[PDB]
Amino acid sequence: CTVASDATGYYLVVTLAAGTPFVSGDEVLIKSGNTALVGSIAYASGAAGATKPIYANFDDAILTAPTTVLVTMAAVTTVSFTSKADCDAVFVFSGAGNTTKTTSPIASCALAPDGLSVTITLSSADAYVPGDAINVVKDQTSAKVGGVGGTNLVPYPTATTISPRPFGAKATLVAPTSVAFSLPAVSSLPAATAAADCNAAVRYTDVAGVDAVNPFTSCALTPDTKGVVLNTASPIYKAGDVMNIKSGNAAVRWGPQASGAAYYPAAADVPVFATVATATLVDPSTVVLNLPTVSAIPDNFTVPDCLRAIEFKTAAGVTKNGTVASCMLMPDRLGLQVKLLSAGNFSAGDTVNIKPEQAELRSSALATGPSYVPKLAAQVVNPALFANANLTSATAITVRLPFASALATGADCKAVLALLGAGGVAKNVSSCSLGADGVTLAVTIPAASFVGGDVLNIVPGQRALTLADGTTAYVPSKAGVLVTPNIVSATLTNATIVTVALPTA
Amino acid sequence: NGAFELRAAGSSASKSSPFSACALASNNTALVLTLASASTYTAGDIFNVKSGQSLLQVGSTAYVPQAVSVLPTLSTAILVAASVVRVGLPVVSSIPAPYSADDCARSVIIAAANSTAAKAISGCVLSADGKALLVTLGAAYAAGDTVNVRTGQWQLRAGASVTLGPNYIAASTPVAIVPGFSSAVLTSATQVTVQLPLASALPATISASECGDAFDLLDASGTTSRVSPWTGCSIGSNNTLVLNMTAGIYVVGDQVTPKSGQTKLTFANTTAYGVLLTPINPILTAATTAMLTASSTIVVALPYAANLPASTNNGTVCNAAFDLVSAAGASRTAPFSACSISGGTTLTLTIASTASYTAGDRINVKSGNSAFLGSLSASGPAFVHAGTAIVITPTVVSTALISNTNVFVSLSAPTSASAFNQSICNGAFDVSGLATPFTNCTLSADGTGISFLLASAGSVTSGVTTINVKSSQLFLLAAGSGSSDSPAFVPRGSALTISEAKLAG
């Protein structure tokens, strides 16, 4: 046994063996011969003050639902609940910091058949303010431990917080190395978060059922602040993974950091599911769905079956009907190529996502791997840079992007455009600009750095180049462009021989 | 269990004692692991062998751990209707929402006897509980037709949702199709009719002891079967089978089925139907009695137990289950606006204001009944009956002593015909103080009351005497248009006490 201290004083935390629970009417007395428990020195024994009868409190209190609180009891209880008056007779609510609420939040109570848990339903979901507690009232004569003739419950020197679970928790896979995990309300984390706090809060497991141990380097907050995002250095995902909050949570909380309550672990573990992370339109009639794992398609993939597993949709949100000509799964098993009827079935900004409850696209196998699942927000169709790029001059290249586009002002060109030579060796760029027509883009390469044969591409992680809507951004292409030569002019040299200004060797 | 195991996806511990009797078969190649009689599978179960075992030996080596995933297969197949096939499944299953007749033809084959060619199908739909699948045959049934699951089929997955579970695969031996019971209806106290999409054969010189040896009788849950056999079993018109039962050998909710592997009958002398547990739909047998207790209400004494939604019903519920059939056979509209069952054996209805009663009516269960169940349970075998209806018989309602020299009685229906003669004065009523209490009697204008002159003034003792209708009397008959619709009056449940009508003060 161990001693812990708080405002009310110093307490002894004694334990019973799992085979002998507590019974009403028992008493605790200091045993003759004690030597371990000391104040200044050891405890005497045999005085009338050493013996004290034991009286009951409640085991726990949890928020199982948006308006449901389950209070487990330290023994089988004989209570009669019939009306809101009875609930207020036994249970008194309160707030964080010992403060007092003006009105009661309770509506009705209900005792379990076995007398070991009482549900508590609130009037509304706005009544449970974060950090609220529960307790028993001074000399309440209703609840009993030991039948009608037993001994009542008693107030406890301190109020007991209500621990919220993440009901409705679904864990999905956004990238090869990142996972989301949503929560039932506005949550929070400590300001100075480190990997120790991250891995103390969440848990990861593989198909076999063995603990993964410390994968999470960092974690953060969702834009709607209703979930946590967890990242890893390298991909580990498999089919059959699960996730949950651990049993020592002290970081993820309901409401303000300084006053909230840390989440409990969910009742059931939440298997991980793959989605669409990016949609790179690689050519005017072909859309490649970037994938975060090894994927498997129907043994034969027809137009009807592929149309059970996508949703093309205009910027405003109107589904488009005639798109699919065929769908073929890629060699690397990390992409899906859906060919189009014509170059027109894609307009600027259009978006893609998975259709729910489909059985075609799955994780590593068409038999047992879970299928993909829809994304909370549909995915944007990034246009890869594959349009014509014709060398206008030894220092300036021209790119005829096919769609209406706008470009950031004052952005550093080094984070937008790049040039690739033989072997993938990148080369520096000096400046860059966008024309008034909204399509033509000029790249100011360093003088003489380009040699006939090199291909232009787009810097990974760029965010300066975007379509007209200003929210869709370009991305690199597999081969860029085999930039072609354009002659400048020829000069009046002499009457029979003329020299032509060929741009490059 | 000390060498093998069966673990769920993500389970940190193996299932405890899952194997009841492990065995070997074939050329020492078929490890037939007998499970519990009521075991349970879990989606994507994993088999393996514990580390360092020695029970199963091979050469001088021993099997070392390597885990596999279990996959399901079919369990049974019946022909329920002329063109419907009820394939059983071992665990819950599902098909992907829109599911054409092409997909079913893609993932199941029915081939002729000693053949491997396909037979077409019109369509398929899952069952309500999901453990069965129903197939519409596109051609006539011939004994020997077999069904199997097509290799490479993936749309049929165990588990409640398709996006998580294995896929059925072909069994080495296709599941032979045999027919079975379509339905069955109670026809009397000691009979039942059964419907088959077949022909059939009789056991020549039948014997009493053999009918039971073929078929069986089941209790509510389908666990226990009744002991004694029944008296007969034969064949009838519309490809039917008759099972005349022993007296009192029925219990509410009981099912009926042939026994596993029976060969007492053979369609086309070459194939017989297998086991299927079949409810029995009860009806208002000849034990049901009806009475018109008042000019606006009825009472019916249910022979068995029943139940209705809630306990008060609005008008449409009673209308949708019950009928007021004229004495001619036609059906009247909205006779009832409120009915109820009290005690699960007494049914009281109430003719609505817009409705009214006519002599010779009858109460019969509605065709297409869907709310009046033949069990005390909310889910049970409903009544379905369109044959003989119950008579309904009126009685007296109220009685009062007009003066010390007159008695008065009121009726629940008119008798305004001219048939009234003096014999009704002393023949249709009984007073328990005199054999012939009256001397004269006269009707009212509307036929809803009679005034009797007594034999001796004051012989009625107000508050004590009792007046009630004689049993099996034939003098007083309802006001019908003919002999077919003039039911005779009958006694009340409790005799009425005559109270003098006078100014109290």
Question: At which residue do the structure tokens 């009928």 appear?
Answer: B323
- Could you give the CA distance from residue A432 to residue A465 in angstroms, rounded to a whole number? 11
Q: In angstroms, how far is CA A343 from the centroid of its own chain?
A: 36
- Looking at the complex, report in whole angstroms how far the Cα of residue B34 sits from the nearest Cα belonging to chain A: 24
Beta-bridge partner residues of B78: B86, B178
CA B293, B296, B302 angle in degrees (round to 5)? 50
Residue A110 CA neighbour count, 13 Å, CB half = 10
Q: Closest-CA residue in chain B for A371?
A: B163
Strands in B83-169 per DSSP E = 84-88, 93-94, 108-111, 121-126, 132-137, 146-149, 157-158
Asked whether the beta carbons of residue B162 and residue A240 sit closer than 8 angstroms, the reply is: no
Measured from the Cβ of residue B395, the count of other Cβ atoms closer than 10 Å reads 19
Q: Is B183 exposed, middle or buried (0-12, 13-18, 19+ CB in 10 A)?
A: middle
HEC sequence for A356-415: CCCCCCEECCCCCCCECCCCCCCEEEEEECCCCEEECCCCEEEEECCCCEEECCCCCHHH
Chain A contact set for B95 (CB, 8 A)? none
Chain A contact set for B96 (CB, 8 A)? 308, 357-359
Could you tell me which residues come within 8 angstroms of residue B59 by beta carbon, excluding any fewer than 6 positions away?
A: none
- Looking at the complex, report in whole angstroms how far the Cα of residue A209 sits from the nearest Cα belonging to chain B: 4
- DSSP assignment of A434-456 equals E-TTSSEEEEEPPTT---TT-EE
Residue of A211, A238, A354, A357 to mutate for B, most B C-beta atoms under 10 A: A357
Asked whether the beta carbons of residue B162 and residue A271 sit closer than 8 angstroms, the reply is: no
Beta strand pairing call for A91-94 and A68-72: unpaired
Q: Closest-CA residue in chain B for A373?
A: B163
Scanning B1-133, the segments in alpha helix (DSSP H) are: 101-107
- Looking at the complex, report in whole angstroms how far the Cα of residue B95 sits from the nearest Cα belonging to chain A: 9
From edge to edge, which strands make up the β-sheet containing A106-111?
A106-111, A117-122, A68-72, A62-65, A163-164
Residue window 98-117, chain B: list those with CB within 8 Å of chain A: 98
Chain A contact set for B155 (CB, 8 A)? 359
Contact B137, B170 (CB under 8 A): no
Asked whether the beta carbons of residue B7 and residue A368 sit closer than 8 angstroms, the reply is: no
- Could you give the CA distance from residue A489 to residue A502 in angstroms, rounded to a whole number? 8
Chain B contact set for A242 (CB, 8 A)? 10
Of the partner residues B10, B162, B166, the one whose CB lies closest to the CB of residue A368: B166
Task: Report the candidate in B278, B276, B279, B277 with the shortest Cα–Cα distance to residue B76.
Answer: B276
- Looking at the complex, report in whole angstroms how far the Cα of residue A448 sits from the nearest Cα belonging to chain B: 56
- Could you give the CA distance from residue B169 to residue B150 in angstroms, rounded to a whole number? 7
Of the partner residues B11, B96, B166, the one whose CB lies closest to the CB of residue A209: B11
- Could you give the CA distance from residue A142 to residue B388 in angstroms, rounded to a whole number? 60
Tokens coding A225: 């602040």
Asked whether the beta carbons of residue B167 and residue A367 sit closer than 8 angstroms, the reply is: yes
CA B43, B48, B50 angle in degrees (round to 5)? 135
Q: Closest-CA residue in chain B for A212?
A: B10
Q: Does A268 touch chain B (CB under 8 A)?
A: no
- Could you give the CA distance from residue B129 to residue B135 in angstroms, rounded to a whole number? 16
Chain A contact set for B7 (CB, 8 A)? 208-209
Chain A contact set for B152 (CB, 8 A)? 299
Alpha carbon of B179 to those of A373, B21, B194, B254: distances in Å?
A: 41, 33, 13, 22
Task: Report the candidate in B347, B355, B263 with the shortest Cα–Cα distance to residue B305.
Answer: B347
- Looking at the complex, report in whole angstroms how far the Cα of residue B166 sits from the nearest Cα belonging to chain A: 5
Q: Does B66 touch chain A (CB under 8 A)?
A: no
Q: Is A160 exposed, middle or buried (0-12, 13-18, 19+ CB in 10 A)?
A: middle
Residue A86 CA neighbour count, 13 Å, CB half = 13
Of the partner residues A269, A367, A371, the one whose CB lies closest to the CB of residue B166: A367
Chain B contact set for A358 (CB, 8 A)? 96, 163
Contact B44, B9 (CB under 8 A): yes
Beta strand pairing call for A405-407 and A465-467: antiparallel
- Could you give the CA distance from residue B255 to residue B192 in angstroms, rounded to a whole number? 11
| Phi/psi of residue A437, nearest 5 degrees | -65, -15
Of the partner residues A209, A357, A367, the one whose CB lies closest to the CB of residue B10: A209
| Three-class SS state of B480 | coil
Beta strand pairing call for B178-179 and B76-81: parallel
Contact B164, B141 (CB under 8 A): no
Q: Closest-CA residue in chain B for A297?
A: B154
Q: Does A367 touch chain B (CB under 8 A)?
A: yes
Question: At which residue do the structure tokens 């809101």 appear?
Answer: A84
- DSSP assignment of B167-188 equals B----SS-EE-EE---EEEEEE
Could you tell me which residues come within 8 angstroms of residue B353 by beta carbon, excluding any fewer than 6 positions away?
A: B337
Asked whether the beta carbons of residue A357 and residue B162 sit closer than 8 angstroms, the reply is: yes
What is the dihedral angle through the alpha carbons of B492, B497, B500, B505, rounded to the nearest 10 degrees?
A: -110
Task: Report the candidate in A231, A235, A241, A180 with the shortest Cα–Cα distance to residue A210.
Answer: A241
Q: Closest-CA residue in chain B for A356?
A: B163
Q: Does B436 touch chain A (CB under 8 A)?
A: no
Could you tell me which residues come within 8 angstroms of residue B400 by beta carbon, excluding any fewer than 6 positions away?
A: B408, B498, B499, B500, B501
Question: At which residue do the structure tokens 């951004």 appear?
Answer: A473
Q: Does B67 touch chain A (CB under 8 A)?
A: yes
- Could you give the CA distance from residue B287 to residue B169 in angstroms, rounded to a whole number? 53
Tokens coding A154: 């008693």
Measured from the Cβ of residue A153, the count of other Cβ atoms closer than 10 Å reads 24
Measured from the Cβ of residue A371, the count of other Cβ atoms closer than 10 Å reads 25
- Could you give the CA distance from residue A315 to residue A378 in angstroms, rounded to a whole number? 11
| Three-class SS state of A476 | coil
- Looking at the complex, report in whole angstroms how far the Cα of residue A224 sits from the nearest Cα belonging to chain B: 28
- Could you give the CA distance from residue B402 to residue A277 in angstroms, rounded to a whole number? 94
CA A318, A324, A327 angle in degrees (round to 5)? 130
Residue of B94, B164, B168 to mutate for A, most A C-beta atoms under 10 A: B164
- Looking at the complex, report in whole angstroms how far the Cα of residue B171 sits from the nearest Cα belonging to chain A: 17
Asked whether the beta carbons of residue A371 and residue B166 sit closer than 8 angstroms, the reply is: no
Beta-bridge partner residues of B236: B240
- Could you give the CA distance from residue B354 to residue B352 in angstroms, rounded to a whole number? 5
- Could you give the CA distance from residue A439 to residue A467 in angstroms, rounded to a whole number? 9
HEC sequence for A208-277: CCCECCCCCCEEEECCCCCEEEEECCCCCCCCCCEEEECCCCCCCEECCCCCCEECCCCCCCCCCEECCC
CA B167, B160, B20 angle in degrees (round to 5)? 70
Q: Is B202 exposed, middle or buried (0-12, 13-18, 19+ CB in 10 A)?
A: exposed
- Could you give the CA distance from residue A119 to residue A63 in angstroms, rounded to a whole number? 10
- DSSP assignment of B204-254 equals SS--HHHHHHHEEEE-TTS--B-SS--S--EEETTTEEE-PPPTT---TT-
**Helix or strand holding residue B258 (H, E):** strand B255-258
Of the partner residues A240, A298, A308, the one whose CB lies closest to the CB of residue B9: A240
Max Cα–Cα distance, chain A, nearest Å: 130
Asked whether the beta carbons of residue B9 and residue A370 sit closer than 8 angstroms, the reply is: no
Task: Report the candidate in B184, B182, B186, B183 with the shortest Cα–Cα distance to residue B388.
Answer: B186
| Phi/psi of residue B285, nearest 5 degrees | -70, -175
Could you tell me which residues come within 8 angstroms of residue A11 by beta carbon, excluding any fewer than 6 positions away?
A: A3, A4, A5
Question: At which residue do the structure tokens 């279990």 appear?
Answer: B70
Report how far apart the first and last C-alpha atoms of chain A are (Å, whole number): 87
Of the partner residues A271, A299, A370, the one whose CB lies closest to the CB of residue B152: A299
Tokens coding A221: 């907050």
- Could you give the CA distance from residue B237 to residue A369 in angstroms, rounded to a whole number? 54
Contact A296, A362 (CB under 8 A): yes
Contact A69, A119 (CB under 8 A): yes
- Could you give the CA distance from residue A219 to residue A225 in angstroms, rounded to a whole number? 13
Asked whether the beta carbons of residue A368 and residue B155 sit closer than 8 angstroms, the reply is: no
| Phi/psi of residue B398, nearest 5 degrees | -135, 150
Task: Report the candidate in A286, A284, A357, A364 with the shortest Cα–Cα distance to residue A328.
Answer: A286
Asked whether the beta carbons of residue A371 and residue B163 sit closer than 8 angstroms, the reply is: yes
What is the dihedral angle through the alpha carbons of B266, B270, B276, B280, rounded to the nearest 10 degrees?
A: -30
- Could you give the CA distance from residue B273 to residue B77 in angstroms, rounded to a whole number? 11
